[PDB]
Amino acid sequence: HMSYTWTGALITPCAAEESKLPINALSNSLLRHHNMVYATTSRSAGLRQKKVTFDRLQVLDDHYRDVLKEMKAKASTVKAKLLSVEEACKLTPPHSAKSKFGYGAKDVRNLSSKAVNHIHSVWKDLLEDTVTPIDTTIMAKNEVFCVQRKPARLIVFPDLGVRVCEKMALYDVVSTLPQVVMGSSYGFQYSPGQRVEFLVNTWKSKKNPMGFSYDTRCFDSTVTENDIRVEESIYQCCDLAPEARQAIKSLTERLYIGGPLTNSKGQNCGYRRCRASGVLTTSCGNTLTCYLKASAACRAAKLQDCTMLVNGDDLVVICESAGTQEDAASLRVFTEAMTRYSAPPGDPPQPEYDLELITSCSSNVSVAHDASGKRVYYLTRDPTTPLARAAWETARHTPVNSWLGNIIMYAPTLWARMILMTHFFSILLAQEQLEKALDCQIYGACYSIEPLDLPQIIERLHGLSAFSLHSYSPGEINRVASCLRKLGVPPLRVWRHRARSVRARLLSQGGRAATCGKYLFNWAVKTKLKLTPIPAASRLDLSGWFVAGYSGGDIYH
Amino acid sequence: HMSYTWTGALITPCAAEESKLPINALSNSLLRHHNMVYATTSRSAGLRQKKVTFDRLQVLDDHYRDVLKEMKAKASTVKAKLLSVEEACKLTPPHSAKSKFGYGAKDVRNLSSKAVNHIHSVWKDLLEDTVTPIDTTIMAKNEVFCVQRKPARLIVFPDLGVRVCEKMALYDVVSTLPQVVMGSSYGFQYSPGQRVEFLVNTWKSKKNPMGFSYDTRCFDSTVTENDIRVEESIYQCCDLAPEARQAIKSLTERLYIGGPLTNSKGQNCGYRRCRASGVLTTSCGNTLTCYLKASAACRAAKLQDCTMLVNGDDLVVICESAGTQEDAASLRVFTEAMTRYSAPPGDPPQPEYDLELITSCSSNVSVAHDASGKRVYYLTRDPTTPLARAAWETARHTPVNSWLGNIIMYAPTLWARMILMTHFFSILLAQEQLEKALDCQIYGACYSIEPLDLPQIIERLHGLSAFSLHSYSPGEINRVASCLRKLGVPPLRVWRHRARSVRARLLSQGGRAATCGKYLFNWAVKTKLKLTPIPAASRLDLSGWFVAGYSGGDIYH
């Protein structure tokens, strides 16, 4: 029951790949320790192949089937619509991988006759054939990290025409079903602020709280054919059009369960019998399967008054403590049950008794103080990876601007405000690119965002307090200082000085730019301004933001 | 403000010049119409002198300074390094013109004491003196053409010690800055396949596309002292070592802006006040200046959603059509603006509504079909000049093998595959010279290439489809057939017969030679082999191949 079989053919690149941090005139103003930053390339794909390849055994008991029956009962309340070819075309990112059949992402977006006709023929083939494995491309992802080197992650995706078909059959399912099936436990329905609110309230709701995060080792490779057929049975509980039922069955049999792996050069690399990392259902399938196995493992471990929070393969549980020793025994039982279900751990879970020490979705809750001095809970994370990626983005234009997604998601943080806002607004001003729309990712979906809209986006997502936070926690301050020293990032005095300069440059431009100066950089001045609601913030259509997860899902807005 | 002043001394040859096509026993197998092929010589240098000599007037408006301000802001993000003497020496072509100071290109390449000491003294002189015009040699280039006769082009170059110094000061600048300043518009960052992909993707991104190429008459002579000082100001925006700033200032003042012209015999020919065709900055300087004048002219003409593509003096513009009549008027304004900027046209530009009809870098996009029957865009050109040069190279060993550069650059074409590959592999087989490295030029830089490495080189540059193209366009077929009748080149049946013979000979040798037979000549057999990726192609280091243009730049890779 191997996750993969391989032919020995290489996972090849599409274009020239760089691994060493590129340097320009701006790099040193951010980070001095260049040798610590690297990008993964196809060269290390061979090592990832080794890591993702293993036998899966699955032993399913009554706790598993009981949870599954409950999930199916909730899924039966969902009604989902079939999207038209045109609606599905409009969800395609403009830089999405081109079809092998003579059309690209812009052709799909423009509803070009060639693309639309090819999609209709893929759709007809899905309804008529429910057996033939669909071809997929396997690529090494090019991602930036800080040392201590990891091999490249792999992306497995079907052709562009198939991806539009997945959206037609399943977009509405994957956007609606998880919140119905999992309720308050579905993490992707929350903005960072709402996630913090749910974690704090959950923690406070326990008499003696204990929390832990569970890291499954290579979650996608642990997903078996059973798990994928179980996910299909959940989707099939929905009230669906007969064409959607047929397309979902066909996509499950031909694509979701497994299929051949083709490199960028057209050679056969092997065969997948686990979750594809680049399909529409990657996020929803992972969340449901992680929730199903974890809920059943919570029952096997006899965890008391359990609240789970699930985002794909990322899981956090907050429950009633039975004291340190018994909590450790309970987590070993939880782990044994997850292993029997084919979700063994990477790092073994550790019980935590301080909410701030729980890391989930590489994030944690922390506390600061607003202008009035009130305690404010907010979401933060270790700044290492965001700062390493920012260094790369300082010297190279990338398809996804992580700095922009990071400011959006982590706007109240000491590091996003002091460093990211200051560094990138300085660059945008100098190039007169404040008004240029940039791509970024939020919960895996792609958004085109104008940096001038940032104050309004931040106010809508985090509130006005995000522009006034101070008196950060000692743990947070220590982590940020430690990261600046490790990467060779300049100290506060330098960032405060650059921020006053950036603020001054923005203020004189007036309009939206002055608003960026006034709101984003109020922390940098001696005589702070009275920050009041921005009128334009009401007009922003933020619907579709924080509804569901789409990592690997090829979704645009 | 004359481009040149002349004393009356003649532009003299360096060696024996042949004008008539040399004939050997192999000539007739390629071309029967011998009298149609000729090489230019110093005998026509006086005609070229008259063509290149004219007054330049320049009127610089707000659009020009607005574009220059933007280019400078992007140039300010560049960090460039000085090359060491050894790094600069290794970039010198082994057959590069010897120094008048008792050392040659091999002495430079070998880091010889005499060469290194003379280079150090030239470097010190550049730092100490920023006024004295640097001496240059003027020569009439010996180039092969097909009649309908052009006068010889002129090459102006400083001494070998100076050329090494230009590399130290400017190699990193000229290789990095253009792509930063011009982004996707910098043509030399693309392989032929990438150039076609950029042109088709640009053409498809417009609702109603319109395109044109712009031909400046004698571009080098149109370049003024202002243009050259403006290029220097762009280079000076970089983050540079102060020693590099001084050497760049010195080279601009003493060489780039102008200087005395000396013939091969040591006589003063005159004085240049325009672009030197044989300096390191010729390509980068022409590209920046053409991009600057054209971007400013696009604004004066009110061209909508402009995408430019620039390679030295060669320019392509693709924009949003405003209707036929508006498009033609817009081109007239564009021309008037280019003229005011001292870049008047040779041929008046013409609006095109078919991508295939746009000719730029003497090339055009065309379409054929791969083995599957899929439409494939590829770069082609009129084969007259490539075939005339191939005839010359059949009877004479030349410093640059144009047949080889043409197979590399135009590998998917009907003419390079049927004629060039067949003819030259037949010659190499008969002489057992398949393994012998030959010099060719790619974007002006010199490369030593083994013909046995062609299948891997072609696969990497063009993909496997290059070995399977068929169903060429009627426009392409008739242009190739018309060229064969003009030159008296044998028909398809002859080339196909010869290719089966060449293919059979290669296959029997095994190894790299059989790969050549199998991939290059698969079009020649009835029962075609299904071609698959070559393992040696992955191991091929093609770094520095499609990074920048170096025409006249004395660069070796």
Ligand SMILES: C[C@H]1CC[C@H](c2ccccc2-c2cc(-c3ccccc3)sc2C(=O)O)CC1
């Ligand atoms: C974004 C802004 C928020 C307020 C902050 C600020 C304003 C005035 C006085 C102190 C600070 C401040 C600086 C910190 C720091 C810790 C480790 C590394 C670098 C800085 S932590 C901190 C705080 O309030 O908790 C200054 C930066």
Ligand SMILES: C[C@H]1CC[C@H](c2ccccc2-c2cc(-c3ccccc3)sc2C(=O)O)CC1
């Ligand atoms: C290199 C190879 C590519 C396939 C090609 C080929 C194979 C089988 C049948 C026809 C051809 C072929 C020959 C052409 C030609 C037109 C004018 C002058 C000379 C030839 S054009 C052409 C085509 O497919 O478009 C034959 C040569």
